[PDB]
Design a binder for this molecule. Structure first.
Ligand SMILES: NC(=O)c1ccc[n+]([C@@H]2O[C@H](COP(=O)([O-])OP(=O)(O)OC[C@H]3O[C@@H](n4cnc5c(N)ncnc54)[C@H](O)[C@@H]3O)[C@@H](O)[C@H]2O)c1
Ligand SMILES: O=S(=O)(O)C[C@@H](O)CO
Ligand SMILES: O=S(=O)(O)C[C@@H](O)CO
Lengths: 274, 294, 289, 294
């Protein structure tokens, strides 16, 4: 176990049923059961992909003391950094898999993390028994580097959504609507349940852009929301940006398409095809 | 009961159709005569204008595209006001500006008339099957009076808890879902650009705040309880957002909402919230809007 | 000349005052100048009776319509020989509709909104942004030069409001961008005066309109002087630094996603002036180059 | 003088060409052998790698796309450090991350070598004519030593006032100019969508802060003098921005920078700045960045 941070410390604690630069962190794990990296499994849980590399390949690195018999990076790092590390370890005969975790440090404590299993379909079994104690659910990401990839998508979505949710909630407060009422409504719609499993499956994801809710009408409602926010001085940077995305969809002739067609617009914007 | 229905559009037409199916007597108006004709086939009496539609109706329903057309249908040349009785109840089910709704409810309360806001959640497919989400504003008395009529058009009613609270919860819901659609698109195209099957992303996000939202997950026992002690620190959220935007920018997936959201997290860091729970972003947006800190 | 003036606000009041000072005869109305020689009127209609020129200076295009076409409106008192001058800053499409709805009833209407502040309204040194026909601008110029010091022929009906909006959009948004650059400057402990000296030698301080654009994108030449890929990369460095120093840069952040869209569309090796072409395509216009 | 020049791109090539024209001896390296060949025709000595280029050079110039390629050219396999003397002066004229520059200047100061940052303002058109703006970081001694070499590539030099201050003022300049290009595009396309000739817009904007900028017009005697009394009120600026965004949204001209800018003005209004001069936006962005109000 390399890394005794907000996630590392409780994860290692659940295993006890070790190296870190902070001697106090070392001391806390010793009083629950190494100066640098004959173990079957190396787990790294470190803040960035540089520290992971410097802990595997640096002066007094893991590689110098590692056996030819899975290294599991559970860190949140750059996917391309993960790909290069898995290849640079595959180059020297060693096996490396990416198993980052979903959910927070509260779930790390209770061993109820979402385990986001990258690496080979075979390789998942080899580490799976060990890591299925540290989380409550495992998702087969379906290849090397797919673990960190689905972690990034999930974290992007949840972190940005928090900012958007804040704008909606303070506009709610500025309009003197109890938040409890907003939440009750939004829990029954895409607002609370998301579009991924509601508006998208039978429309854009099925290649059907025939309208259930038209982009023009969505665009118009966004205008009302931004007028209200601007008269009540609730800054809504995400709302403001989102209206200009809808505006781009209108410019491209998608005005009478279903709102799920925004997905197709962002695909075109990224230089993808239909 | 005797109902006037003005606005026979994608929503209006099947809503009015469900009222007739439930044995109500409808006077219908809309500028499109074909829309009028579809409801007349189904038993509605046609009216030449809003005034005629409103004559001796207990309930006046408007379903129109904006608050100006609602005003011009209530107060304009041959308006609802000209044919309305002081005993009737006006239900605007339109999505319009909440402050336009407040002014219309007051300008109808000024002339002895009763007006309530009952906008709807869900689409035209649900209007057809009478399974709309009914977002009932107006007084508890007005909601009780109107509920029997409303339950012919929708399968669920939510008491929004006052005049104008119906349109407000509609606006908050629609703001959230319309903007979220744009954010969801950024996540899905970054997913595709990284060659991750989308079904895998959705499976993962369905188990976290990404798919379940923050309102009922990260918020209740943290910021909404006045506890800002970190479960997930703003600085770490800020860092992960940076990685996402670096990747998107290397793969040329434009993420305007992500990019804006990082500058919100940056503002939270500048204000000393870096070691607070990510739910503290709510407190940052409240301060940013000139509200008193909780 | 015989003038009706409707709207005696922060701008209206001193503008009408300068018209009287220049020996014009004013009928004035406002919902809330007589000391200074104006005849008061009970409503727009009365104000308009036997006026050659009707001036409106109101906060929005709805109040302009309700003052021209409403109960006791200007149309009620206007002659077919008179000229309506809306000097209000309102929606351009609202101006177009008002000029047409007045041309429909035999009345003549031009847009002459004003640039510069209420200090300039007081001294009669406003920037006059003269829309309307060449004839209407000639006819109105003598009246207008009593309220402003400089007149710009916008070159048609509705072009007055349009050039006001474009100018004000550009300057108001630029203020926000300039702020981001200046605070990042301070966060890096670079004296501002040094940054300004440097930026005065580049498009940063001189702008792109008259520097990098004329001989590149505006000439249909997209061959690089400065490549979009490198511009995109520099924006990345700026946002990383700002994010480490907690200087929020919402305009920078948005701008990088615009450059990112230009890269997605295959413009990475084009000149940075090609961003104009990208925004034209984004707005559903036909590509020029 | 004996100069090593590594990076013969859109900037590098003509800069090195101007050094040869001024009778300096250049050892040139680039991964593109055709770029090497163009400067060899003009009198340059080709080198197989950075090391060879650096052997017995008084001045080492790097002009590369990013700070990683600069490091790999200075410290990599057959790097500049392998052929560099303790007597030479390394001048990175690249646009890279300021912290990457600080680390490179320190990692070269650690091995007895001298390194300074002299990035350039203006484009490759100015590189060709030797009229670059030279943004001289490093010590005043290093700037004096390098100035005669530098003045062959640029027409003016600005003493940025220390190591790493060259790249810092380059970043401020480049941030401003790159983002301004995006904003200028929004204004010009809204202009076209409204069927207003651009030349008319430019004539007007040339007489205001739109064309002249705020730094030297609206800011000096207001916010930069500590005076926030209005010439143009934030509320009025906020209103005009709203009209522009309504028009753009009706004509489907996407204006992401405009839309973001209005939310900045909105934050200024929430903070009580509505009746302050528009120059007070500077003070709002300072507060947003956690700086003390001036
Ligand atoms: N283009 C401008 O207007 C301008 C002006 C001022 C500053 N800058 C900055 O100056 C730098 C150079 O810009 P440019 O316009 O010359 O770009 P460019 O891509 O035309 O020049 C880069 C050159 O470096 C070469 N190169 C890349 N990696 C190399 C390596 N490891 N070893 C040797 N050669 C290598 C490339 O082949 C190319 O010839 C960048 O940092 C840029 O942002 C650009
Ligand atoms: O993935 S989420 O649960 O939204 C965030 C948590 O994983 C913190 O890293
Ligand atoms: O200095 S600017 O004219 O803003 C751009 C050019 O120098 C490229 O770096």
């Amino acid at each position: 176990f390399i890394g005794l941070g907000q996630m590392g410390s409780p994860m290692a604690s659940n295993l006890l049923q070790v190296f870190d630069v902070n001697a106090e962190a070392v001391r806390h794990l010793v009083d629950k059961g190494a100066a640098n990296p004959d173990a079957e499994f190396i787990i790294t849980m470190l803040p960035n992909g540089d520290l992971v590399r410097n802990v595997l390949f640096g002066e007094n690195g893991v590689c110098e003391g590692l056996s030819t018999d899975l290294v599991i990076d559970m860190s949140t790092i750059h996917p391309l950094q993960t790909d290069k590390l898995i290849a640079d370890m595959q180059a020297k005969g060693f096996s490396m898999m990416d198993v980052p975790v979903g959910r927070t440090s509260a779930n790390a404590i209770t061993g109820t993390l979402l385990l986001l299993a990258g690496g080979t379909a075979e390789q998942v079994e080899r580490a799976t028994p060990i890591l299925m104690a540290m989380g409550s659910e495992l998702i087969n990401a379906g290849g090397p580097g797919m673990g960190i990839r689905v972690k990034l998508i999930n974290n992007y979505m949840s972190i940005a959504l928090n900012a958007l949710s804040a704008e909606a909630a303070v506009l709610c407060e500025a309009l003197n609507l109890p938040f409890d009422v907003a939440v009750k409504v939004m829990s029954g719609t895409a607002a609370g349940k998301g579009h991924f499993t509601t508006s998208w499956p039978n429309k854009v994801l099925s290649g059907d852009l025939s309208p259930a809710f038209m982009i023009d009408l969505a665009h118009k409602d966004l205008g009302i929301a931004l007028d209200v926010a601007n008269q009540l001085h609730v800054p809504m940077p995400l709302g403001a940006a989102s209206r200009e995305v809808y505006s781009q969809a209108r410019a491209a002739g998608r005005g009478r398409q279903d709102w799920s067609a925004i997905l197709e617009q962002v695909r075109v914007s990224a230089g993808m095809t239909a």
